[model samples]
Target: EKLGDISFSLRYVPTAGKLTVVILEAKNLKKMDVLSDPYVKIHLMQNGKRLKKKKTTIKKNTLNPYYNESFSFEVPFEQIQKVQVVVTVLDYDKIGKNDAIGKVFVGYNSTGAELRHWSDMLANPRRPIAQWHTLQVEEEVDAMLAVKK
Candidate 1:
């Protein structure tokens, strides 16, 4: 049977200066065979530009699997717009293609708000404003699912 609609939440934990620790929790993942060993993808976006993509393999057969991943990177404090997390599930049973089973959007910063306002203004020439970072969804699938659970 196919996996039911899978959902996850991302928590940003402060690790060190300019670095963040990302924690992902899978809910209702027991319905599908492939859920135990599925691939995960996380995308970090700033000002509509993709800053980084983090991926990892998650083990299977557990009631609720918690994947804790971390990355160290630098983000321009001024241009940070928004951050989005994309999770893809790789079906081990299907060898040819993989399907995206889950996705979530989190944390729209002040820069993101400003960018939207600027876009609205641009539609009307009468209202012109300086727009820097725009809202963009970049494909950031970093990790692959493990074959064995």
Candidate 2:
């Protein structure tokens, strides 16, 4: 069940007080496929609302895709404290719901490791903080996502 890993960077703009997201890449995905047209969807959830999803370009025919994609949210310096990075690896489906590969959440509900990666962005304010995070599979998500050709 080694789906893959994603590397991404987060940068905080003190002047603009915004959070910029850069999705770097996905490497060594041993499952999933081109038919699904795999991509990553980032949802910035704040307070009681989940924002619209931001997606990386669809990558076809490969496990290792270099996205280097970018997206952002105009989060004030204070709102960062209450925001959640809800990133899910998914496949585009013409019929029914899109498929979910795995996910990573960075926020108060996130694990300590995810919080560290998040705080590192603030600790170094102007500079971009980059890290590789392992994707976690929910058993339900895995049943539909794992090694499906």
Candidate 3:
């Protein structure tokens, strides 16, 4: 089964001192044993390290979920160039470990669609630019960050 794809948006405003992330939705998520209650985890990383994180409310019993939730992180203009966004979709469970469905990375160091998204955000400040990205596993995500480490 495929990890699936996610649609999201990113915006940065120097005057507002904020970097915004919008978790729009996910589709065709890989199934688990139980019906999935999925949510989004957005991580803001600085210099390849996590700076802060936020989450969207879980959408109960759905393989394809719509979030349309926006989260913002305080970031100075000077710091924006060094930061990255990691958006992860996970199944919510009351039990042991929650299952991570997949993730999308966006930053200056990233490549392909991820890099293009980040570039557009920087090029057009204060305007939200969105795209649909194919989700990836931990190994692929980690390799994308190899240059940062």
Top lDDT prediction, candidate number: 3
How would you encode candidate 2's per-residue C-alpha lDDT over 49-129 as one tens digit per residue?
A: 776569899897667778999988887876777777777877666677876777876765455677788888878997888
Each candidate structure's count of clashing pairs: 5, 0, 0
Q: What TM-score fits each model?
A: 0.48, 0.83, 0.93
Candidate 2 error regions (>4 Å): 33-36, 94-96, 138-149
* Pairwise lDDT winner, candidates 2 and 3: 3
Compare candidates 2 and 3 on TM-score and give the better one: 3
Per-residue lDDT of candidate 3, residues 1-149 (tens digit): 78889999999998878889999989988786646788999888876578999999999888899989999999898777777788888888988788888887888788898999999998999999989999999577867765762
Order of models, best TM-score first: 3, 2, 1
Q: After superposition, how far is residue 46 of candidate 1 from its true place, in Å?
A: 4.2
Off by over 4 Å in 1: 1-19, 33-36, 46-49, 61-63, 82-94, 109-149
Give candidate 3's root-mean-square deviation (CA, Å): 1.6
RMSD of 1: 12.7
Better of 1 and 3 by lDDT: 3
Question: In model 2, how large is the Cα lDDT of residue 13?
Answer: 91
